[model samples]
Target: SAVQQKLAALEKSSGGRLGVALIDTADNTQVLYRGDERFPMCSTSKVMAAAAVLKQSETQKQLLNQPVEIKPADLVNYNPIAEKHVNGTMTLAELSAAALQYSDATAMNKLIAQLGGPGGVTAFARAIGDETFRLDRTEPTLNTAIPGDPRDTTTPRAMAQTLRQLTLGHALGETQRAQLVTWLKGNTTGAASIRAGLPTSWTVGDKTGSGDYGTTNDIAVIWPQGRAPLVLVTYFTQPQQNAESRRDVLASAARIIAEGL
Candidate 1:
């Protein structure tokens, strides 16, 4: 009842469609708002791609350590890893670090092509229990004005659930799972969104997603003091609005939800 009222109050105040999934991992309580609806996951799809790449890395450690050249022809315009401009050559693990920690689109584009394209990414999502995630297009193309262009999408519920799976060691081996957590914790983007609302003592492992439109999203594992972690996810679309305001919505929601912690 508390969760429902919280969701209702937030919905009543917002002008856009919002989806949320909050889980108290210690007690295993869940609260969902528009949990079944899909929204653009944007670069958040990179997490799934990284998991796919890491799956291969387990058998071929070289895949993560060996260098590859990402040609100028393959470069996209947004957040290219520094290496894209440096020597244009980096190891797979380096690429993954850039993709996950910086949300570098160029590195993700390269990884998607090397791994298995969008189909490979979607396959990884399914394997990890994000049943409805679709990595329809490559990075930078995640959201475009081209009519009928497919956009990367996932449900808030799927994302939060997958975060739980990740914490519980479902898809990756023990070492890889720890690596994923470290990469997520190292993420430096979206400082104004959900993570901004967390208490000074809390720690968050998550990814942020954005679009040229007003799509803003964040999904994460929030660890507060002296209790189990919480998986708090939010996705919303408020087109024609500025990204700052959209991000603030998620921040505000996090502050409210964290009250329960």
Candidate 2:
């Protein structure tokens, strides 16, 4: 309970709501704080979008290699990768990389559309036995993140459990799972969140998300030396109506959870 107590103090000091779920896959040890509350998923939904792509690729071998057109109209905010590839075509694998490693908005929308929209990604999670994870809208709109609005949201427990399946569970084939982990590990957007709190020798692959009302999140699979991997999710939000993103809150929470575990 020290973990929850420490997280409570951390949340109070930061003046933000904190939700966390830490699971040590080796022995199924769990530490949860506000684990069932809703938090804006923001760009973190891209992880599930990418997983949906990989799942379909299993039955349709050509899915990953399929060329997807990138029209300018499909682009959304936070789309550096998508901006460059406009008027061109990118393979599903490239889009998946952009969405996960670069947090490209257009890349995610394209992937979602290809798989049959946000509902398809939701269905993918459900098929994997994660009932709490859901996706109801596309990017930009999905990032609205209004207070108490449940749309485009997920709980820390749900996110962590789903990440466990994608990264360490039997939901995906070895090749598919490895590809997902590779994308997450190569992510350049989480430098200040979960990735910042861990020791350099500890390996971590994570997805970070940000939105209005101070919504910031990171879901990761961390491998400490001589131990099994841990799936960790941290979602933080501020009380202000239009709060600024706080990477430090996420980092501190990660440290708290790591030490407590």
Candidate 3:
């Protein structure tokens, strides 16, 4: 298979382990490079957290502009709140923007707690039939828990499905769906994966996660006008991997798969 050959060449060239999947958002056609295996999602799990909020807003008719206050005590393994505001008052829109755009742990954890405490986000996961995702909510958990053991995990296939749902407007109302897409478009952290492969002028919406056990991951939707949009996920792990090595592997592998697409 050409895909297999390309993947093998990619692995050899980068000298870093890689797993990748590219799905056609139009019809779910797929190309894979070790994508069937599940890995800890790290902060990439925040994508699901965003979906959970949109889902809840559908039932509650909650407006994104509604004011929500984050108390000092709500910072639990996420810190978007404290970083943005000293008194911690922000609209849902602002918080969502910060969560997706900046990967703000404080805001994310605070929103998770406010929605229904630590268990709320998990409950939303269950409701959505995403069984692989979990949150370790032991007491004394701080607002930042990255580069440590991940208590939550998701797979590439599951994440693709989640994004599909978002695109189809199945997980949230139209208003919330629009808002979710807006936030996704604003995500700027993971530029070296899918975006790295495309022309400099192309637009990509993406998120990246790096955490315990050398986890490095990215999920993205690439927008190239007149062609079918590409949904891509890449994950890699090695105990001693450096950032440059990982970035090189991810960028090159993504270019290979995306070129075929």
Candidate 4:
């Protein structure tokens, strides 16, 4: 298939490990290349945390606009000057928007803790029946302390599935799903992979993740005119070497794949 040839050429060019998955949101057609291999999610795991929060709110019929007070101590490990933002309260909706759009680790970490520590979050994920996307229990590391991953992990297949659920409106209620998509649309931080590949006129909702192990990952939902929204997840890694080259490799591959799509 064309994708197989592209993957082969990409591996030869990059001289590194690469995993990719593409899903058609409209028709559910999928093309996967090494999607089962697990990789560190970096900040990408924040998507799952966001999903958990939205799901809970929908079940409880809670209005996201309800004001929630965030204390300084709640941002213990997140904010440098903990007392600076004291008594600054935001609604659940505001926090959610900040979490994704700004990728605010401090606000997100506070939200996660408030939702019920890591253990509680894990329980929530299980309750929602997302077996493939569970919290990885490792001694809290730098990224782990935040709402996203310090040690969070997932596979290309899992990432694609999560996106599929979101697109299908199965992950959360209609309003919550709309909110998530809107938040993702404003995701400006992670632009190297999916965003880099697409035409400027096209819109993409994407998030990027990187880690200490030279791991770089990106997951996105690409909406092209007349075509179904496409789910793309790319994972790149190299042992004992800088990951910038690997990132370029994945980016190049993504560009090629996007052209074909």
Highest-scoring model, TM-score? 2
Off by over 4 Å in 3: 12-16, 74-81, 137-150, 241-245
What local lDDT does model 4 show for residue 64?
70
Worst 10 residues of 3 by lDDT: 138-147
lDDT of 3 by residue, 1-261 (tens): 687688778767664566777788667688777766566666676776677777766766555667777666655454544555746587776777777887777667756755676567777777766665566552234222333355565567666656656654367778777777777777777677656876666667777776544566788777667677777788766545343326556677677866666
Clashes of each: 0, 0, 11, 3
Full-model lDDT for every candidate: 0.77, 0.90, 0.66, 0.67
Q: List candidate 1 stretches off by more than 4 Å.
A: 80-87, 145-150, 241-245
What lDDT score is found at residue 211 in candidate 4? 54
**CA lDDT, candidate 2, residue 210:** 90
| lDDT per residue as tens, model 4, 1-261 | 787788878876775567788887677777778777666665676676677778778866665766677675566333432234568677777776666665556656755665676565566656655555555542124243222233455667877887768745476789878878888888876666668777777778877766554667778888888777788888776554344534666677678777876
Per-residue C-alpha lDDT of model 1 across residues 1-261, encoded as one tens digit per residue:
676677668767776768898988777888888887777787677788887888778888667888878776666756547444655688888888888888888888878987779988888878776778888788667744222234577778888888777755567878878888888888888688888878878988888877755777888888788888888888877655454347887887788788754
Off by over 4 Å in 4: 61-63, 66-87, 127-129, 137-151, 245-247
lDDT of 3 at 211: 56
C-alpha lDDT (0 to 100) for residue 112 of candidate 3: 71
Model 1 lDDT-worst window of ten: 143-152
RMSD of 3: 3.5
* Residue clash pairs of candidate 2: none
Error of 1 at 76 (Å): 0.9
Clashes of 4: 3
